[PDB]
Amino acid sequence: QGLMQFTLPVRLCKEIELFHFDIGPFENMWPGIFVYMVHRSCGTSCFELEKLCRFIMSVKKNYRRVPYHNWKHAVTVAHCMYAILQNNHTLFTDLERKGLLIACLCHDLDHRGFSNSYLQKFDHPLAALYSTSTMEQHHFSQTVSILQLEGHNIFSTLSSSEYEQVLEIIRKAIIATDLALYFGNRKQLEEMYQTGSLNLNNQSHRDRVIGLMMTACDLCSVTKLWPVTKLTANDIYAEFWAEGDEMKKLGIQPIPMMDRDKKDEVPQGQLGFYNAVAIPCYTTLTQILPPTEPLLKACRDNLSQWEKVIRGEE
């Protein structure tokens, strides 16, 4: 009988319920922040704590020391999904809520800071094992691996068929973080909502809405207060530019997003992205799940902050 709660300090206990929460620069608190989120989202009974803790720590170990796709990203993306699940209490099964916080913390396992594009032009062995969504099939592969280490099976009290449902929600959730897949997924959801045929009882439909949720959580840097958003931009471009450096070494002109000699275009490159991906993403999500409106508001605040960078007012 487990009378053992995690409690956070007052400021965190209050801020962590808000969508724009920043998990802070103290790495050693991030595991307690995740367990706290599982317990409130899912219950104290969801996972054997010894097993949960061991799993968290093996996930941490299999994230690399890159500027953006790192352990802090993992925990950030999982906090966004917690906030979505907490403002949509009744819409999700017990299994989706277990699976989705895990999917979020695993979604970029063993990321090296390179796009799928660069793996295919480098001719990386993972581009032969997996032809599309290369890094994403790999992240799911790494998650099965850690799940199958001794003491690390956190679903060990699910039946054979419940266990297979959760691993299938985790798989689809990780594949959907392939931003190449998002454009189609969002248009479909857009039509389904506007012709009125979107049904949350239809598993193929649920699967699209989770997919969208995964895109929203993954991109949640654009939904933070401006000082966080802006400082996280530096880390994103530090990967993008290292990737352009590697493209130039293969003898290919990278796109300007990856070319550090084109740092000047960055504010205009963020507008493109906010208009072409982020605003559309958080728009369709608010339409399907009205309580996520604060992600769209925050996103429109950061688009307005980037227009102010261009008009030389910062």
Ligand X SMILES: Cc1nn(C)c(C(=O)Nc2ccn3cc(-c4ccccc4)nc3n2)c1Br
> For residue 119, what are its two tokens?
């793996």
Q: Is 219 in the site for ligand X (CB under 6 A)?
A: yes
Find the binding residues for ligand X in span 17-76 (CB under 6 A): none
Q: Min. distance of Cβ 77 from Zn ion in angstroms?
A: 6
Tokens 């949640």 locate to: 220
What SS3 class is residue 62?
coil
With beta carbons less than 8 A apart as the criterion, state whether 308 and 314 touch. yes
Long-range contacts of 296-305 (CB under 8 A, 24+ apart): 298/19, 298/20, 298/222, 298/223, 298/224, 298/225, 299/222, 299/223, 299/274, 301/226, 302/222, 302/223, 302/224, 302/226, 302/229, 302/274, 303/271, 303/274, 303/275, 303/278, 303/279, 305/226, 305/229, 305/230
Of 20-28, 260-268, 292-300, 303-311, the segment contacting ligand X by CB under 6 A is 260-268
With beta carbons less than 8 A apart as the criterion, state whether 266 and 305 touch. no
Q: Is 73 labelled as part of a ligand binding site?
A: yes
- Alpha-carbon torsion 155, 169, 91, 274, what sign? positive
Q: Is 69 labelled as part of a ligand binding site?
A: yes
Q: Is 275 in the site for ligand X (CB under 6 A)?
A: no
273 binds, among Zn ion, Mg ion, ligand X, none (CB under 5 to 8 A by kind): ligand X
> Which of 207-221 are b and which e, b meaning 16 or more Cβ less than 10 Å from the residue's Cβ?
ebbbbbbbbbbbbbb
Q: Is 292 in the site for ligand X (CB under 6 A)?
A: no
In this structure, what DSSP letter does residue 275 have?
I
265 binds, among Zn ion, ligand X, Mg ion, none (CB under 5 to 8 A by kind): ligand X
Query: Which one from 20, 39, 69, 138 is the annotated catalytic residue?
Result: 69
**How many angstroms separate the CA atoms of 16 and 26, rounded?**
15
Member of 166, 189, 222, 295 binding ligand X (CB under 6 A): 222
151: phi > 0 → left, psi -120 to 50 → alpha, else beta; which? left
Member of 70, 133, 177, 185 binding Mg ion (CB under 5 A): 177
Toward Zn ion, which CB reaches closer, 109 or 189? 109
Q: Min. distance of Cβ 227 from ligand X in angstroms?
A: 15
**How many angstroms separate the CA atoms of 176 and 179, rounded?**
7
> For residue 269, what are its two tokens?
């490159």
Toward ligand X, which CB reaches closer, 43 or 272? 272
Of 45-53, 57-65, 129-137, 218-226, the segment contacting Zn ion by CB under 5 A is 218-226
Q: Is 257 in the site for ligand X (CB under 6 A)?
A: yes
Q: Tell me which amino acid residue 178 is.
A: D
Task: Please indicate whether residue 205 is annotated as part of the active site.
Answer: no
Q: Is 226 in the site for ligand X (CB under 6 A)?
A: no
Toward Zn ion, which CB reaches closer, 46 or 221? 221
Q: Min. distance of Cβ 61 from Zn ion in angstroms?
A: 18
159 to 198: interface string for ligand X, x by CB under 6 A: --------------------x-------------------
Binding residues: 69, 73, 107-108, 218, 270
The set of catalytic residues is 69
* Binding footprint of Zn ion on the chain (CB under 5 A): 108, 218
* Binding footprint of ligand X on the chain (CB under 6 A): 179, 219, 221-222, 236, 256-257, 262, 265-266, 269-270, 272-273
* Binding footprint of Mg ion on the chain (CB under 5 A): 108, 177
